[model samples]
Target: AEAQATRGRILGRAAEIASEEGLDGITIGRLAEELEMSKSGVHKHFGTKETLQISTLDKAFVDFWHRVVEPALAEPPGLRRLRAVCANSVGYLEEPLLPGGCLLTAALSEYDGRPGRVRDAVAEVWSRWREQLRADLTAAVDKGELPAGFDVEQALFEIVAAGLALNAAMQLQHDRTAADRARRAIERALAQS
Candidate 1:
């Protein structure tokens, strides 16, 4: 139990570093040095760097889901719920549960060019997020929260794009207006009925 907690502790720290830097930037040597532990000690918990990366990504997902996704899930299903999800996602980047912003976004940028398990893991997360958005938008349409002919495909694409762009704007320019503008744009896009 103690060892498990220690490993969790190490992974937590690793996830934070992964949040600040891209997952590819994290190295066992650097983590061990930063933690002031033997490299073997860190390796004992995660036998390989890829394992460490995967584990940290897992941690990041849990953190993001709790901080962003779950709260949105709490709202009633419809356009409102979808907006909540969209806004919360941008909030996750703006308020930043992670120091650098969305780890999943950073991971995507880091691994998109590489073909491996790590990239696969990142893609899996992105796929899940897209699927969630699709489901929410579809629910909104089915429930008549949106117009009968509302284009779920186009709206989904726009919402995700706007969310990412807003995050980038907030992160790069530190613009206070980025999130509200993005949220309003998303709400208007959903309001087309």
Candidate 2:
């Protein structure tokens, strides 16, 4: 139990704080304060704030994989699955599965201009996700859902990036209709392409 409490407790508590706050919330000192322990106590476990943040990011990625990728892959990887993945990702923008609150988005916002480890991580996720979208669109092509010889990569990039942007726009209290409209917009685009 002591061993478990050391690492798991920090990661779990950091996750809670991160969701409530943002990436900045993943502070070792703050986590220690919330856990009723000393700074040294926290350091004994993680040794560094960056280490703690990385662990929290890993935890967040676990949730991301479980919530977004696994189920979407489970369904037939065609238009239905493609649409489902987009829908699920949009939902995640507002969900509690991520601590940093749209963690990838929040992290990128912090490091948007400055390229470093954090920005690299964010860029990698986008690259991998976009690649998967292309693959899914390829499946849609096979199923006669997408048009023949369509630039799978370009179409996926345009639609998915727009979907993510539309999702962030949906978070704007004024864009209450954006969520529903965005999904339909993608559906329409797919139909045309």
Best prediction by lDDT: 1
Candidate 2, residue 181: how far the Cα is off, in Å: 1.8
Q: Candidate 1: which pairs clash?
A: none
- The residue-by-residue lDDT of candidate 2 on 40-98, one tens digit each, is 88888787777787677667677776787788877888787887887787666645364
RMSD of each: 1.7, 2.8
**Candidate 2: misplaced stretches above 4 Å?**
1-6, 19-21, 98-100
Cα-based TM-score, every candidate? 0.92, 0.80
lDDT of each: 0.82, 0.70
lDDT of 1 at 109: 80
* Residue 11 in candidate 1, Cα distance off native in Å: 2.2
Can you write out model 1's per-residue Cα lDDT over 1-193, one digit (the tens) per residue?
Answer: 5889878777778877887677887788978987888999899888889989998998888888887778987788877677787877877767987677778888988899999999999999989888888888899889977778998888888887877787788778988788888887787767662
Model 1 misplaced regions, further than 4 Å: none
